[PDB]
Design a protein around this ligand. Structure first.
Ligand SMILES: Nc1ncnc2c1ncn2[C@@H]1O[C@H](COP(=O)(O)OP(=O)(O)O)[C@@H](O)[C@H]1O
Ligand SMILES: [Mn+2]
Length: 376
């Protein structure tokens, strides 16, 4: 009677199981507790997760990501049409629906967004099966609070394609609240979720175990990727200065620099400096340099400070003052950035923020708790 909880994320996904009184977040084969929502196709194999993201600079047309931006939408949806312009892979109109078109084992192959997502789900499921030592056929899968019926259905369909019985589709902010036991009078909770691609602020009221979404706010195109890109621009300028060379138009160079920037960014959450070392970045030139946390914070200052406007807006929409919020929960990997935590804490006049659960694991953690409840 064992079910898993799955955060099927725009940029990173995560799988947990509640067993013998506690949640285990299941690490992938590289030891990472979260997995990139990436699928890549080569002349010989299909790569999912870390191995797919790792080779993105060498196989841009056939490395698919951001399927969550397509899932449950029609090809003619203006959101899809806008997003298509930003991706290196092809999206085609098949019977009114978007399909990503790739080259795989020497043939053209097209996949629905829910098929791409099913591949990510299948990998997560299989990792859980290896961990537990038996099949897993039940799961709770999470979605953004703003998802419509079509998007929820397509996500549930991804689960069925992956061989799961989907016990429930639950909202991400609700899962995060469940992770912290906030459902166990009225309790008002604010979820601040700054991820890899999206920023969501949710206000929930919880009364006798029942959740009501009181307000949602945010930006569907603000996240960690934007911070990586501020670092990229910075280092593009440093390369123009040290070498009189604009690497800006070499797509591979920019991609490899972005990968290095993401790694450096992560390091800056626990250290005040980070080294970048890119062998042969551009014309056999090694690029060895460094970046301080404080410089990184400056480079992103407008974006970090801008996260407080959706907090204000959500509060206004929920007709609540700051002070009336019982609990604030940090979700999303970008909330590990010290400056983001300071900004939010200062906004809330110094109070404690719920962050003891790794913020990039909290959604899966809550999903895992709820999956076990549903099986009981
Ligand atoms: N220690 C860290 N410091 C800063 N950013 C991080 C850290 N760990 C992960 N990230 C970033 O978190 C983002 C992913 O957030 P996550 O919540 O895991 O996924 P999603 O938003 O797709 O659900 C990525 O931009 C990643 O680089
Ligand atoms: Mn997320």
């Amino acid at each position: 009677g064992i079910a898993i909880g799955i955060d099927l994320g725009t940029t990173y996904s995560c799988v947990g199981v509640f067993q013998h009184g506690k949640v285990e977040i299941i690490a992938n084969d590289q030891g990472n507790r979260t997995t990139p929502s990436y699928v890549a196709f080569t002349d010989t194999e299909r790569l999912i997760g870390d191995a797919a993201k790792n080779q993105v600079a060498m196989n841009p047309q056939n490395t698919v990501f951001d399927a969550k931006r397509l899932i449950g939408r029609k090809f003619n949806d203006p959101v899809v049409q806008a997003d298509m312009k930003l991706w290196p892979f092809q999206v085609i109109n098949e019977g009114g629906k978007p399909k990503v078109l790739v080259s795989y084992k020497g043939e053209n192959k097209a996949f629905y967004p829910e098929e791409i997502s099913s591949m990510v789900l299948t990998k997560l499921k299989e990792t859980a099966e290896a961990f537990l030592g038996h099949p897993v056929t039940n799961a709770v899968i999470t979605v953004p609070a703003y998802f419509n019926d079509s998007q929820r259905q397509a996500t549930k369909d991804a689960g069925v394609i992956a061989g799961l019985n989907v016990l429930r589709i639950i909202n991400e902010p609700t899962a995060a609240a469940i992770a912290y036991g906030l459902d166990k009078g009225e309790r008002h909770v604010l979820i601040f979720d700054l991820g890899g691609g999206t920023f969501d602020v949710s206000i929930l009221t919880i009364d006798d175990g029942i959740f009501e979404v009181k307000a949602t706010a945010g930006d569907t195109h603000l996240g960690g990727e934007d911070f990586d890109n501020r670092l990229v621009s910075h280092f593009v300028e440093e390369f123009k200065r040290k070498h009189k060379k604009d690497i800006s138009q070499n797509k591979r160079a920019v991609r490899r620099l972005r990968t290095a920037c993401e790694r450096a960014k992560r390091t800056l959450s626990s250290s005040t400096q980070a080294n970048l070392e890119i062998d042969s970045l551009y014309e056999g030139i090694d690029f060895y340099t460094s970046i301080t946390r404080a410089r990184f914070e400056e480079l992103c200052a407008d974006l970090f400070r801008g996260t407080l406007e959706p907090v204000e807006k959500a509060l206004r929409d929920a007709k609540m003052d700051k002070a009336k919020i019982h609990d604030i929960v940090l979700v999303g990997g970008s909330t590990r950035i010290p400056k983001v935590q300071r900004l939010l804490q200062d906004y809330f006049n110094g109070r404690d923020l719920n962050k003891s659960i790794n913020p990039d694991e909290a959604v899966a953690y809550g999903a895992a708790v709820q999956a076990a409840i549903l099986m009981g």
